[PDB]
Design a protein around this nucleic acid. Structure first.
Lengths: 106, 106
DNA sequence: GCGTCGAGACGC
DNA sequence: GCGTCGAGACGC
DNA sequence: GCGTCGAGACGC
DNA sequence: GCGTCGAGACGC
């Protein structure tokens, strides 16, 4: 049971999820893709998978079909925001069309 | 009920509670007294009352004798740390001996 | 609300 | 001296 | 009127 | 700390 801060830092470091990435060499700012499910540029591995990994690794309930979209992602974002090691600092749209949130590691 | 950010800002503004005060004229940083109950400098009106006001005004559970110490303050501080409009940024001690936490209004 | 740490009163 | 057990503050 | 997001009170 | 469930605003 690692801290949320350490958990997310390892996920970003891993490079396992496209768009879940550092902005800087100093690794103080990271992006979390948040493209709506209804958007034509939603991509599962980018916008959906991390949320599922959060709920499988941290959640305390069975991971059923209701998590095939963004349910786990919503839960994960709430976890990141309420962590004192992190702080949402902005958001944007990439030139490839996808939506992201920006967090800073304190 | 007001948002928790609006709730605490109003409490600080009000000057009801000694030590529950702004650090700056710009009202971006406030202090919450957190002197421990068994510390020789503990003063109810400063270190205890606000926490009980939190429980009375925000909670739904009976306000019994269990809140005659720092239980309410504890629940309040947790709520303050978790709210997205606020960030705990420090801690201090004053010349009268009391301890405080510092929050920034974002 | 529990887990870790460990006050200080106690036994020898 | 140095063991016992485990206050009340605080991290989780 | 429902779906997504996610307030903040709660348990431990 | 960090899970639970799910306010009321808003997109659909």
């Amino acid at each position: 049971k690692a801290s949320i801060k350490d958990w997310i830092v390892c996920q970003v470091n891993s490079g396992k999820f496209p768009g879940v990435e550092w902005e800087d060499e100093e690794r103080t700012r990271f992006r979390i893709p948040v493209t709506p499910l209804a958007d034509p540029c939603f991509e599962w591995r980018r916008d959906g998978e991390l949320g599922v990994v959060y709920i499988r690794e941290r959640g305390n309930m069975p991971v059923d079909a209701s998590f095939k979209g963004t349910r786990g992602r919503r839960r994960m974002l709430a976890a990141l925001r309420r962590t004192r090691g992190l702080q949402e600092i902005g958001k944007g749209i990439s030139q490839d069309g996808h939506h992201f949130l920006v967090f800073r590691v304190r």
